[PDB]
């Protein structure tokens, strides 16, 4: 069809312009994110057994539900956490499962197993939801005047902000982190012990008199305040959200799965604008934590990188062609293909993410390659034979179209298999594959439609002045001619002793194998997200005052030695277990431009935070950067599950856990390996004598009420306007300090009501036990989370954990979860990835060139490029990762292209009659210049990624360095060994001459 | 496209290799089953009202739920049954809806009226389930050491076997039947007479006493809910160990009586997860059971008394073996004729690739590998072989007759046949696709695979138009002079076939010479085909010996569990004496009720078919010996389901007549109307056997409560229920009998053995004050004859009537006749057809319409292929010839016009049509050359003789094994065989002697002329 467009330039221009218009419109309509939809579908099942406690809930509810859900279609795995009187089973389904249909199936199974579950549980009702549990944005209301305090701000948010934020499209759930006033003026057992009451008297009297100030609450006849004289109960600070050492209402925002974070954030901000339009007096919304900002800046940076790559490719193509129009043609080819790729992305639903932009940046050189071939040949014909631009273009098309077709076919074929892979790794592969393949296809189409027309119109007959530059360009031309002569001599040398150089090639293959073995595997690299979390782990049940003081210290440190714009945290909420004395500092860093030095990088900041809070047994303040992929995983470190598949028992499982933790501490590869589960806590066991209950005349439930007045919630009447709370909780437990044990002597209200302290009616034990019980995939498990020590990759850390598991008592498994599971999947997929890519290349070439020998040689070419990629990544110290594997695929494609460039022409000349040796040498010379030109163009197009620096540059460096090294060897080695490969193959298989 | 691939062999090779790899992966991922799911999505709602009258159950549970369900999306119809103590509402949903979403909606609608339902049912909880009552495999653990209790064995199973089986790949559910450990309150029958039972009060005390703290690490670890702890719990002399409980309980939780060959075991049913290979899943289960057996304390021997997977596997084996043997026979025939090993190799390579492509498409669409899929695979391999063999034969004959080199011969042969190939592909597509339009998924599968196998001949349009031409262009080597024809059997056979061809040409010339007579013969063929088609019974699926039979002992409404066990033992002994049963596991309850005391299920696995080869040892005869002879007792209704067909939906002329509409007419009035209607239906000749499937009214006793006197007295109605509970009262439960494990507590008068009948309206009742006053003073017990179960259809109490059409009378005609016979019945009563009747009423004329459409499309396509409006008529006329042989064979065999027969007939039509198209195309080409119609026709007949003979011989010999099948799936195999074999024989002979006549007749009639 090339001739058709040659004679119809207007038609080609029309097609190109239509493509450009479609691209612009698609870009306007295309959603923008950072990463594709890697979030695995997740369904949460929640049940409650108020009449039960921990480890009875697990046996009666958790185990039954998890056994029923076993065998669910698409069920990736199951994590079941059973607390006291509450069971939560999160069933993670594999990527590609309809969340709603999955929830439907879960509900069906839940109804099927409902009968087995305790009737109390059935009446309670087990809920099934699909909401994500990852906070994407936080909202805080701050009153500048200070008129509205925590309770007032919380009421304001609940009245306006809360419902409006839920109304916003794209957010699944808005969680509130505020608190409301209460009036817990109730004594401790020290007070009652000094007295002779079991607090039924006073609590009941307060209830009667309610039917009022805290003083008046205490001053109640049993008007004795002293009997109830305690610290002024006020739950207004109950779950205080500490933003920059201040108290503000916390509004966690969890965006709904499959929702554009940027658009959802924008909608949230607009709704907050309206709420502030109806603000009370001084209240204003101050979002302290956001994720979309890094997404936006990353997209901007990659766009800038793309522009720079385009500039560099123009530079190289000019250096070779040395004429503006000739360089102009491929530069015009580039954007059209990119815009068509954008349109296809919109058609397939692929959102504009960092990965697709990486694909475009890599594409640029591959896109220019074909037009480079076309224009180079047209110029050669227009100079050597002096053909008119039209005639030169026609002849060049006649002699170049086959090469164009072959190169495009091999590239698309190499980018085909990766798309078929599933999982989040499959999604990343799909992004890159779609981008590259569609771009290359459109590049070929333009190289056969637009490029010929431009070569026949834009190109003007070169005169002697342009023919002999007599300058730097002339020097380049003469030097390249000299290099071509030396290259011909070198290729003759390569073919002189084929056995020797083939042995060298086999050595190259061996070195490839060794390098691949040495290179450590890893997942996507870390980046300076601009925000991080400092989990202040505290002893379970420690006074919340200690946690709050520690949080204040953290906030001050972040405001003294760190560049933190927003140091937000929640008291009573943490990934430690969400305990009342557990907090997490959701710190947001300042601008990345301000944070330019290495110390100002988030990693160094976190390291300094750990150092500052090192040597603190009281508070384990562990800082962590935001996970690079917040969907598949939630913790920066690996997710290890210590499954008790053998059923060794809880105590034996704990022994295995502690031994593994000690060995991990010994292991140099591992670091910061900690048990996410909370430690054993003292649990009192009141073995109240039921027969004694019968004798006393107070029911066991009546005795339960007596110990509820001893320890139990009863919210009757509050009046404080601050939060407009009408619930004064009579919780004698929390008020003053009832937590201290009463095993010495409990206090009981007998049938008479004389309030004589309980002597032995309750057999208090005050033992200890686990706060929660965790099972993974139906096996009791302990969640051990660690990280790789500096100088070791994540894959190395995972392998270290696996090795240390060896030696644990039989019955202990090393299950992986979260991002660790995806890393295992990627490591398993990598061999299939490369092997399938090479196989598809071979088959495509075989069908294309109607032979097996030609694809055999082209396949022989690949290991050199693979070698170069490995060499570059090792030299820079980068680990093997998904980006490295994609780079490997690209290098396979480029090496195959460079191989074909020589091999096809050599095959043509050989079939004409030229001796295999002679044809090989002649081809090598003829195709030297196109190979070098295209390879340099592609390499310098990838250079900006390799040399990228700053926020969101680790990924760019990771992919670019490997691609650059591969293309470096995919040319230097190829131009010498491809002739050898073809010669040897032609000797092995008698090609038709 | 042949020219392209002829020039590019490696290209075609690559395409074929891609197809092969895709096929391998598809087979790796394809689901495997016996039959595909055809049943419309059905939701079962079950509820239990402990100790409630059937009429009471209908009034509260059945009616409310049924009424509310009306309105669910695609609710095709609603059927409801109200037994005593439980009710079941089957909601049949129209096909196309997702069963899961329907189940969720049903659950929500049940939630809507949960409150209205009685509190006891609320505690029990309405159970909603997608209809999957398919227990494929059964695992039982017998007391191997003779020292393990049934409940002990069940404990071992639940602890270890249950969870492991749940984890096993492709296991939907592992529901169990084994008896457990539940308490059973066992007071004396004089408890109320002596002092008072008032067991309600003490059981409420049990529930109240069991308590846990509400407030946080502090907790209570004291709760007494066990038989031993019942002496420590306050049970309200009064009842306690400290009070007077005495007789505690026994038999723990009496449950499903599990006896594997009269040996106590534990009931552990297993169902396959839908979409999982049953055979492979069975293998997984077997290995897991091996490991667990090693675990077992040498007394828990695992037994498999039931596994449907075995028959599925053996049938699939039969089919696969048939495929392999067919390929071998094709090799044999092609060597017999061509005598060139490479030429023999070519189709033996081409065919499997097309099969694998069919597998790939099948996986893509979602169709699951089933006996239907594989059986029809064996149908189209002959068609697959046919196209490859005609292509290679045309290539080789040019290499022999002419001196064309393999490449040139391939080019010319493809130039000759390609257009015909395209036309034939289209024709076969248009003859197989219409089968999909049927509302029967059986026909849909038999379409999809056969359609993509004619489009495996379309993959041959990418192989036999691409790969086969390429292979012939390369693998074929020029004939080694005449060395291929030596003095051996091969050469003599070749010479003899040449002589036969000469004789055949002379005979065809003779037939053409007198066309009128042979056309009259063809009309006679039409008449014979018609008459044979008339005299043939209609069926849907031929049953086969699965290797197992199910027995259900239905007994009077309630029989003592001891008596039920006695009858079960009698049946089991009879089976162990006069029947070849490998395993005879018996489980109480189950059957229609599901847990009914009278009901009893016997899963009895037969021996291997080899030892049961004798016809009397076939499952049909074995079931025949049962249900009579030993069985047939008046009260003991022991009936053996004679190998319930996996698609339990096939019904030749079954009428699902439902006298649903009540219109206020009393149950008695509806009974009268039912009797009148069934009598009149018996009288009318259009109708046949008509029965009232509902069980006849059994003796009973009612108790008019003294509710008015209870209003006057202090006796509450709940107090009356408690007095019943004292004497005739059970089904309440307890909790926490063994730790977290939740068991039950059941009040039983006089311990286990009350031994009382006169308790009816005799027991005194102490009032609210406590004064002993017989409720019999005002409450009266009266003998009655009430119905066992109340059935309501679409919200109307109905009498399900099952009938068949009288021989020769149309099913729809008989349904109209049923309606007319009803016409005139008392007002308020109406009819509603269900199941097969309902579907037929919806549409029954699909078949003629799509058949006519297929004929029209074929005619148009042939008109395109021949470039004439007259020539296709001959190809159309060819069709009945093939039908003749299938009809003759099925008549001689006596087999019915089953689905297998019909599909095989369609396949034979396709094969004969392909042959006819080839013949007529070649004849037309020769005519267009200039040769006279007669001579061109003769030449075409001569040429298109050897490929047809080879095709027919290979396919027929491949089909012969199936036509001679011996047990182990014999039914379907022999149906397919008989049909295809007869069609092949007659089709081939009549075609080669008549299609030339057809072309000649058309040419003379319509004045065909040169271009």
Cα A440 to its chain centre, rounded Å, is: 28
SS3 annotation, B364-418: HHCCCECHHHHHHHHHHHHHHHHHHHHHHHHHHHHHHHCCCCHHHHHHHHHHHHH
- Cα–Cα distance for residue pair A210/A197, rounded to 1 Å: 20
- Cα–Cα distance for residue pair B141/A231, rounded to 1 Å: 65
* Token pair for A979: 């002739």
- Cα–Cα distance for residue pair A974/A969, rounded to 1 Å: 7
A-interface mutation test, from B86, B124, B740, most A Cβ less than 10 A away: B740
B221 contacts in A (CB within 8 Å)?
Answer: 685, 687, 765
* Other C-beta atoms lying within 10 Å of the C-beta of residue B718: 11
b/e map of B24-34 (b: 16 or more CB within 10 Å)? eebeeebbbbb
- DSSP code of B47? E
Distances from the Cα of A271 to the Cαs of A135, A161, A268, A778, in angstroms? Answer: 18, 8, 5, 43
* Other C-beta atoms lying within 10 Å of the C-beta of residue A797: 26
- Residue B906 in contact with residue B855, Cβ under 8 Å? no
Please provide the DSSP assignment of B677-698 as one string: HHHHHHHSTTEEEEEE-SPPPP
B101 contacts in A (CB within 8 Å)?
Answer: 101, 104
* Token pair for B811: 């099913």
CA nearest to A36, candidates A260, A359, A282: A260
* Other C-beta atoms lying within 10 Å of the C-beta of residue B648: 12
- Residue A683 in contact with residue B217, Cβ under 8 Å? yes
- DSSP code of A212? -
| C-beta atoms of A71 and B100 within 8 A | no
Name residue, tokens 């277990």: A577
CA nearest to A631, candidates A277, A1, A132, A168: A132
Residue A127, phi then psi, degrees to nearest 5:
-100, 145
- Residue B866 in contact with residue B892, Cβ under 8 Å? no
- Cα–Cα distance for residue pair B531/B551, rounded to 1 Å: 41
Q: Count CA within 13 A, CB hemisphere, residue B14.
A: 20
B129 contacts in A (CB within 8 Å)?
Answer: 111-112
Residue A577, phi then psi, degrees to nearest 5:
140, 0
Shortest distance between the Cα of A437 and any Cα of chain B, in A, equals 20
| C-beta atoms of A850 and B11 within 8 A | yes
Which residues contact residue B238 at a Cβ distance below 8 angstroms, ignoring those fewer than 6 apart?
A: B195, B202, B244
- Among chain A residues, the shortest Cα distance to B164 is held by A67
- DSSP code of A220? B
Query: Which of A71, A108, A850 comes nearest B104 by C-beta?
Result: A108
Please provide the DSSP assignment of B903-951 as one string: HHHHHHHHHHHHHHHHHHHHHHHHHHHT--HHHHHHHHHHHTTHHHHHH
Helix (H), strand (E) at residue A942: helix A916-946
- Cα–Cα distance for residue pair B950/B385, rounded to 1 Å: 10
- Cα–Cα distance for residue pair B741/B786, rounded to 1 Å: 40
Shortest distance between the Cα of A57 and any Cα of chain B, in A, equals 9
- Residue A853 in contact with residue A907, Cβ under 8 Å? no
Query: Which of B100, B167, B735 comes nearest A70 by C-beta?
Result: B167
**Inter-axis angle of helices B515-534 and B872-893, to 10 degrees?**
50
Helix (H), strand (E) at residue A725: none
CB pairs under 8 A between A and B: 129
Name residue, tokens 């640029």: A364
- Cα–Cα distance for residue pair A955/A886, rounded to 1 Å: 12
* Token pair for B296: 């077992």
CA nearest to A612, candidates A566, A690, A555: A555
Beta bridge partners of A537: A620
Residue A224, phi then psi, degrees to nearest 5:
-90, 105
- Cα–Cα distance for residue pair B448/B432, rounded to 1 Å: 8
* Token pair for B539: 């069926």
- Computed from CA positions of residues A482, A485, A490, A491, in that sequence, does the dihedral angle turn out positive or negative? positive
Name residue, tokens 């696969």: B320
Cα B667 to its chain centre, rounded Å, is: 36
CA nearest to A397, candidates A314, A467, A456, A330: A456
Q: Write the burial class of residue B415 (CB in 10 Å: 0-12 exposed, 13-18 middle, 19+ buried).
A: exposed
CA nearest to A961, candidates A864, A899, A883, A897: A883
- Cα–Cα distance for residue pair A378/A382, rounded to 1 Å: 6
Q: Count CA within 13 A, CB hemisphere, residue A321.
A: 32
CA nearest to B155, candidates B329, B300, B18: B300
Rounded to the nearest 5 degrees, what angle is found at the Cα of B44, between the Cα atoms of B38 and B47?
A: 170
Cα A420 to its chain centre, rounded Å, is: 21
- Residue B414 in contact with residue B2, Cβ under 8 Å? yes
* Other C-beta atoms lying within 10 Å of the C-beta of residue A824: 15
A690 contacts in B (CB within 8 Å)?
Answer: 209, 222, 224, 232-233
Shortest distance between the Cα of B239 and any Cα of chain A, in A, equals 16
- Residue A129 in contact with residue A223, Cβ under 8 Å? no
- Residue B384 in contact with residue B458, Cβ under 8 Å? no
SS3 annotation, A364-409: HHHHHHHHHHHHHHHHHHHHHCCCCHHHHHHHHHHHHHHHHHHHHH
Which residues contact residue A940 at a Cβ distance below 8 angstroms, ignoring those fewer than 6 apart?
A: A309, A312, A313, A315, A316, A365
Which segments within B106-154 are labelled E, that is strand? 127-130, 137-141
- Cα–Cα distance for residue pair B401/B638, rounded to 1 Å: 73
Measured in angstroms, the resolution is 3.6
Which residues contact residue B444 at a Cβ distance below 8 angstroms, ignoring those fewer than 6 apart?
A: B435, B436, B438
- Cα–Cα distance for residue pair A226/A762, rounded to 1 Å: 28
Query: Which of A73, A119, A713 comes nearest B123 by C-beta?
Result: A119
Distances from the Cα of B650 to the Cαs of B376, B440, B653, B801, B811, in angstroms? Answer: 19, 10, 9, 17, 14
- DSSP code of B312? H
* Token pair for A863: 């290991």
Shortest distance between the Cα of B219 and any Cα of chain A, in A, equals 5
Kindly state the greatest CA–CA separation across chain B: 120
CA nearest to B906, candidates B963, B991, B983: B983
- Cα–Cα distance for residue pair A852/B626, rounded to 1 Å: 68
The stretches of A86-212 forming alpha helices (DSSP H) are: 99-114, 119-124, 150-156, 163-167, 189-194, 200-210
- Residue A521 in contact with residue A993, Cβ under 8 Å? no
Query: Which of B11, B130, B163 comes nearest A847 by C-beta?
Result: B11
Which residues contact residue A947 at a Cβ distance below 8 angstroms, ignoring those fewer than 6 apart?
A: A957, A960
* Token pair for B120: 């006891």
Query: Which of A115, A691, A700 comes nearest B125 by C-beta?
Result: A115
Q: In what order do the strands lie in the sheet with B796-797?
A: B127-130, B42-48, B86-93, B75-82, B790-793, B796-797
- Residue A76 in contact with residue A40, Cβ under 8 Å? yes
Beta bridge partners of B45: B89, B128
B15 contacts in A (CB within 8 Å)?
Answer: 847
Cα A825 to its chain centre, rounded Å, is: 15
- Cα–Cα distance for residue pair B76/B95, rounded to 1 Å: 9
- Residue A776 in contact with residue A627, Cβ under 8 Å? no
- Residue B717 in contact with residue B695, Cβ under 8 Å? no
Shortest distance between the Cα of A993 and any Cα of chain B, in A, equals 17
Please provide the DSSP assignment of B186-224 as one string: ---TTHHHHT---HHHHHHHHHHHS--------B-----
CA nearest to A221, candidates A233, A200, A206: A206
A539 contacts in B (CB within 8 Å)?
Answer: none
- Cα–Cα distance for residue pair B586/B604, rounded to 1 Å: 8
> What is the number of residues in chain A?
993
* Other C-beta atoms lying within 10 Å of the C-beta of residue B1005: 10
**Inter-axis angle of helices B970-1006 and B872-893, to 10 degrees?**
150
Name residue, tokens 């670019």: A960
Determine the straight-line distance between the first and last CA of chain A, rounded to whole angstroms.
29
B-interface mutation test, from A122, A713, A843, most B Cβ less than 10 A away: A843
Query: Which of B10, B128, B216 comes nearest A847 by C-beta?
Result: B10
Report helix, strand or coil for B159: helix
Helix (H), strand (E) at residue B972: helix B970-1006
Name residue, tokens 């028959």: B311
Residue B687, phi then psi, degrees to nearest 5:
-90, 160
- Residue A91 in contact with residue A45, Cβ under 8 Å? yes
Pairing of strands B764-766, A815-817: unpaired
Query: Which of B128, B167, B218 comes nearest A686 by C-beta?
Result: B218
CA nearest to B58, candidates B800, B798, B791: B791
| C-beta atoms of B208 and A701 within 8 A | yes
List the determination method.
cryo-EM
């Amino acid at each position: 069809m090339a001739r058709f467009f040659i004679d119809r330039p207007v038609f080609a221009w029309v097609i190109s312009l239509l493509i450009v218009l479609a691209g612009v419109l698609a870009i306007r309509f295309l959603p923008v994110a950072q990463y594709p939809d890697i979030a695995p579908p997740v369904v949460n099942v929640s049940a409650s057994y108020p009449g039960a406690s921990a480890k009875v809930v697990e046996e009666a509810v958790t185990a039954i539900i998890e056994r029923e859900m076993n065998g669910a279609p698409g069920l990736l795995y199951t994590k079941a956490t059973s607390s006291t009187g509450q069971a939560s089973l999160t069933l993670t389904f594999r990527q590609g499962v309809n969340a709603d249909l999955a929830a439907v199936e879960v509900q069906n199974r839940l109804k099927i197993v409902e009968s087995r579950l305790p009737e109390s549980v059935r009446r309670d009702g087990i809920y099934v939801e699909k909401a994500a549990d990852s906070i994407q944005l936080i909202v805080t209301l701050t009153s500048s005047s200070g008129r509205y305090d925590a309770m007032e701000l919380g009421e304001i948010a609940s009245s306006n902000v809360l419902q409006a934020l839920r109304r916003v499209e794209g957010v699944g759930k808005v969680e509130t982190w505020g608190a409301e006033y209460a009036m817990r003026i109730w004594p401790d057992p020290a007070k009652l012990t000094s007295m002779n009451l079991s607090a039924s008297d006073l609590v009941n009297a307060v209830r009667r008199h309610n039917a009022v100030t805290p003083e008046q609450f205490g001053e109640i006849p049993l008007r004795l305040r002293d009997v109830a004289r305690v610290e002024f109960g006020q739950s207004e600070y109950g779950f205080v959200s500490r933003v920059n050492q201040m108290t503000a209402t916390g509004l966690a925002v969890k965006m709904a799965p499959g929702s554009n974070a940027v658009a959802t954030a924008k909608r949230i901000r607009a709704t907050l604008d309206e709420l502030s339009r109806y603000f009370p007096e001084g209240v204003s919304y101050n979002i302290p934590y956001d994720t979309s900002a890094f997404v936006e800046i990353s997209i901007r940076k990659v766009v800038s990188t793309l522009l720079e790559a385009m500039l560099l490719v123009f530079a190289v193509m000019y250096l070779f062609m040395q004429n503006f129009r000739a360089t102009l043609i491929p530069t015009l080819v580039v954007p059209v293909a990119l815009l068509g790729t954008f349109t296809v992305m919109l058609g397939l639903g692929f959102s504009i993410n960092v990965l697709t932009m990486f694909g475009m940046v890599l594409a640029i050189g591959i896109l220019v390659d074909d037009a480079i071939i076309v224009v180079e040949n047209v110029e050669r014909l227009m100079a050597e034979e002096g053909l008119s631009p039209h005639d030169a273009t026609v002849k060049a098309m006649r002699q170049i179209s086959g090469a164009i077709v072959g190169i495009t076919v091999v590239l698309v074929s190499v980018f085909v298999p990766m798309a078929f892979f599933s999982g989040a790794v499959g999604n990343i592969y799909r992004q890159f594959a779609v981008t590259l393949a569609v771009s290359i296809g459109f590049s070929a189409f333009l190289a056969l439609s637009l490029t010929p027309a431009l070569c026949a119109t834009l190109l003007r007959p070169i005169d002697a002045d342009h023919h002999e530059k007599r300058g730097f360009f002339g020097w380049f031309n003469r030097a390249f001619l000299r290099l071509t002569g030396r290259y011909r001599n070198a290729v003759a040398g390569i073919l002189a002793r084929p056995i020797r150089w083939m042995l060298v090639y086999a050595l190259v293959i061996g070195v490839v194998a060794l390098l691949f073995v040495r290179l450590p595997q890893a997942f996507l690299p870390e980046e300076d997200q601009g925000d991080f979390m400092i989990m202040v782990m505290q002893p379970e049940g420690t006074p919340m005052a200690e946690t709050m003081a520690n949080v204040g210290d953290v906030e001050r440190y972040l405001a003294e030695h760190e560049p933190v714009a927003y140091a937000y945290a929640v008291g009573g909420f943490s990934l430690y277990g969400d305990g009342t004395s557990s907090a997490m500092i959701f710190a947001t860093l300042k601008d990345w431009s301000e944070r330019r030095e290495a110390s100002q990088h988030v990693g160094a900041i976190v390291e300094r935070i750990n150092q500052r809070f090192a040597g603190l047994p009281n508070r384990t303040v562990y800082a962590m950067n935001s996970p690079p992929l917040p969907d598949l995983g939630s913790t920066s470190g690996f997710d290890f599950r210590l499954q008790d598949r053998g059923g060794v028992g809880y105590e034996a499982l704990v022994k295995a856990r502690d031994q593994l933790l000690a060995r991990a501490a010994e292991d140099p590869r591992l670091a910061n390996v900690m048990f996410a589960g909370q430690g054993e806590a003292p649990q009192i066991r009141l073995d109240i004598d039921r027969r004694k209950a019968e004798t006393l005349g107070v029911s066991m439930d009546e005795i339960n009420t007596t110990l509820a007045v001893m320890f139990g919630s009863d919210y009757i009447g509050d009046f404080m306007h601050g939060s407009q709370v009408r619930k004064v909780v009579v919780q004698a437990d929390g008020a003053k300090r009832l937590g201290i044990d009463d095993i010495g002597r409990l206090h009981v209200r007998n049938e008479q009501g004389e309030m004589v302290p309980l002597a032995t009616f309750a057999k208090a034990a005050w033992t200890l036990g686990p706060p929660q019980l965790t099972r993974y995939n139906g096996y009791p498990s302990f969640n051990l989370e660690g990280q790789a020590a500096p100088g070791y990759s994540s894959g190395e850390a995972m392998q270290a954990m696996e090795q240390l598991m060896q030696g644990l008592p039989e019955g202990i498994a090393h299950e992986w979860s979260g991002q660790s599971f995806e890393e295992r999947l990627s490591g398993a997929q990598a061999p299939a990835l490369f092997a399938l890519s090479v196989l598809i290349v071979f088959l495509a070439l075989a069908a294309l060139y109607e032979s097996w020998s030609i694809p055999l040689a082209v396949i022989l070419v690949v290991p050199l490029g693979v070698l170069g990629a490995l060499l570059g990544v090792s030299l820079r110290g980068l680990p093997n990762d998904i980006y490295f594997k994609v780079g490997l695929i690209t290098i396979i494609g480029l090496s195959a292209k460079n191989a074909i460039l020589i091999i096809e022409v050599a095959k043509d000349h050989y079939q004409e009659g030229m001796s295999l040796l002679q044809a090989t040498l002649e081809a090598a010379r003829l195709r030297l210049r196109p190979i070098v030109m295209t390879s340099l163009a592609f390499g310098f197009g990838v250079v900006p990624l390799a040399l990228s620096s700053g926020a969101g540059s680790g990924a760019q460096v990771a992919i670019g360095t490997g691609v650059l090294g591969g293309i470096v060897t995919a040319t230097v080695l190829a131009v010498f060994l491809v002739p050898l490969f073809f010669l040897v193959v032609g000797r092995l298989f008698r090609l038709r001459k």
